[PDB]
Write a protein that binds this DNA or RNA. Structure first.
Ligand code: MG
Ligand code: MG
Ligand code: MG
Ligand code: MG
Lengths: 559, 48
DNA sequence: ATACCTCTTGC
DNA sequence: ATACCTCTTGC
DNA sequence: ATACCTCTTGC
DNA sequence: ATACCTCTTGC
């Protein structure tokens, strides 16, 4: 029935028991420079809460949903894999929402034309630790001398696990607390699994072989980073980090192979208004001057005519490939979009995000179903397979069935397939763009692969750091023991129930550039209205939510 | 033909020949291998 | 005594 | 008197 | 350590 | 007071 004793505070220049060590700031600054450059500084802070780990051990676990895949035709459902599980927790902040609110986004997006990522740093403070002790009256006392541990993997020794890919970054609301996630990482494993269908006879091999001892790697924080111990008075801070990576644009393109170059001169123009009064080239298709890449005909049509190269490309879908560890969907860059979609035509390439209350779902809404959406980029660089086709070289037309392959004809005798599903047109002439950011649920920057050769882009984030990326930040509560402890014993050790709270504050800097009017007509711009109006404000209860928004609004020539 | 394109040296027993030293311009080669496949990239799922 | 099919990675 | 959709490859 | 809804009554 | 799996983007 004691308060513990209240203990007394000694005082240095950067801290003590009853001395704050930090300052809260989650404010965003725009600073206009000469020539239309802007320096955007975004501050962000949060109160973070964290419990002691389940157990102070590292574990090696295997996951096995064999049963589900055992089904036949449920290949895609495979979740098998191995992983190391640590006692540490990770503080990840890589995600649009952590840093900006809508108002901000708006601005950026409407007035700028390109954006560069500059630097970033973070710090922790006002640390606090309390212990629970318990008729179920729970009491809480500060444990003045206990500690919080912190480690920053600046060397990037640990494997990299961006958490946004699972919606586990921090929260997006400055005024409400949040937490870090428990850290874990992939551990190697061999695995086989033969695809099958409903109609498939017997049991296609489906097994977990084990682990290529060659491929083994087991890391630990303890052995690789220096751990800091903070007490309340303590505080920690990373330096400032600078990024090396390309800029990101905020404009989208729209021309496709069809709109490149000099359109054909029309010998004949309409003479009155009306949406049926077309113009006419006025020349026999087989009599026109110009250039093609087709040696046989004399036809020259908007679809035949030569273009300098090729925007976009086509690839297989839905493709699953498989290697040593099981199958996985083959990614695309492009996505699709347009008039012939409307989220329902929604296909391959468009990404889809799913998430919780901490990241956008309405706070007050009950029921644990995740909120979702499919981002549909503005950039018209994807494909409409249905429109594709292939024909015989003789090119005698109108064309015969025997000389043409359609998205309609079935391949391999399977009805619901056609060449477009296994087609691929990437090649030296291909040209395209990087994905666009996705607010607020998009990852912001990402690490590059350590392969000898490399992707030309990643699909999860727009900024890929060329060199090293900022090291991960882990934390964890220091074990607080009871008076009984026998390491020699097999049992798990008992600890005092302990937990901690601390504030975290970060600063992320971008640099961008104002855009300027070039066309006569105005352009698209994000804006509020009666329809969405409520998405941007709390409910009479404090309901909040963050809807997704687009990014590359304005157009730009492609050529 | 060699004859038309290089200079030929004639050595007798007493003779001897030597090339200069040549320096390479090319990437390094690593001696480590990777093992993760698309399946092992990133944050594994949290196990409840 | 090796430099991107000559002389000439010289001068 | 042409520089990456302005002024402005200026200053 | 308060200046006209940011940074910044700073520099 | 984060640099490309150590010390060490130090010296
Ligand atoms: Mg260091
Ligand atoms: Mg190092
Ligand atoms: Mg082996
Ligand atoms: Mg292997």
């Amino acid at each position: 029935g004691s308060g513990n004793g209240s203990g007394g505070g000694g005082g240095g220049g950067s801290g003590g028991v009853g001395i704050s060590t930090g300052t809260f700031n989650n404010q965003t600054e725009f600073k206009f420079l000469e020539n239309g450059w802007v320096e955007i500084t975004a501050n962000s802070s949060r109160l973070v809460h964290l419990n002691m780990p389940e157990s102070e051990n590292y574990r090696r676990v295997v996951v096995n949903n064999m049963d589900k895949t055992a089904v036949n035709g449920n290949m895609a459902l495979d979740d098998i894999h191995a992983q190391i599980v640590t006692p540490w927790s990770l503080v990840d902040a890589n995600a649009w929402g952590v840093w900006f609110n809508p108002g901000d986004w708006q601005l950026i997006v409407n007035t700028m034309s390109e954006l560069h990522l500059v630097s970033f740093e973070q710090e922790i403070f006002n640390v606090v630790l309390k212990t629970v002790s318990e008729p179920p009256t729970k009491v809480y006392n500060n444990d003045l001398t206990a500690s919080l541990m912190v480690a920053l993997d600046s060397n990037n020794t640990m494997p990299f696990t961006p958490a946004a890919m699972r919606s586990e970054t921090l929260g997006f609301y400055p005024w409400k607390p949040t937490i870090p996630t428990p850290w874990r990482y992939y551990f190697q494993w061999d695995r086989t699994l033969i695809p099958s269908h409903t109609g498939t006879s017997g049991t296609p091999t489906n097994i977990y072989h084990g682990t290529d001892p060659d491929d083994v790697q087991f890391y630990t924080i303890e052995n690789s980073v220096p751990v800091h111990l903070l007490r309340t008075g303590d505080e920690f801070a990373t330096g400032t980090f600078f990024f090396d990576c390309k800029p990101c644009r905020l404009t989208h393109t729209w021309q496709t192979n069809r709109a490149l170059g000099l359109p054909p001169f029309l010998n004949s123009l309409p003479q009155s208004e009306g949406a049926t009064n077309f113009g006419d080239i006025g020349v026999q298709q087989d009599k026109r001057r110009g250039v093609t890449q087709m040696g046989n005909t004399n036809y020259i049509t908007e679809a035949t005519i030569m273009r300098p190269a090729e925007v976009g490309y086509s690839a297989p879908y839905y493709s699953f490939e498989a290697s040593t560890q099981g199958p996985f969907k083959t990614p695309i860059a492009a996505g699709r979009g347009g008039a012939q979609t409307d989220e329902n035509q929604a296909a391959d390439g468009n990404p889809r995000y799913a998430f919780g209350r901490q990241h956008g779902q309405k706070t007050t809404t009950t029921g644990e179903t995740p909120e979702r959406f499919t981002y549909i980029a503005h950039q018209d660089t994807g494909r409409y397979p249905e429109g594709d086709w292939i024909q015989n070289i003789n090119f005698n037309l109108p064309v015969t069935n025997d000389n043409v392959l359609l998205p309609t004809d079935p391949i391999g005798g399977k009805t619901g397939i056609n060449y477009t599903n296994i087609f691929n047109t990437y090649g030296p002439l291909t040209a395209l763009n990087n994905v666009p950011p996705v607010y607020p649920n998009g990852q912001i920057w990402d690490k590059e692969f350590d392969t000898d050769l490399k992707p030309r882009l990643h699909v999860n984030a727009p900024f890929v750091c060329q060199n090293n990326c900022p090291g991960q930040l882990f934390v964890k509560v220091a074990p607080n023991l009871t008076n009984e402890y026998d390491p020699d014993a097999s049992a798990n050790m008992s600890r005092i129930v302990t937990y901690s709270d601390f504030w975290w504050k970060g600063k992320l800097v971008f640099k961008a550039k104002l855009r300027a009017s070039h066309t006569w007509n105005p352009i698209q711009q994000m804006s509020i209205n009666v329809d969405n109006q409520f998405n941007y404000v709390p409910s009479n209860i404090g309901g909040m939510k963050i809807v997704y928004e687009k990014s590359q609004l304005a157009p730009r020539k492609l050529y």
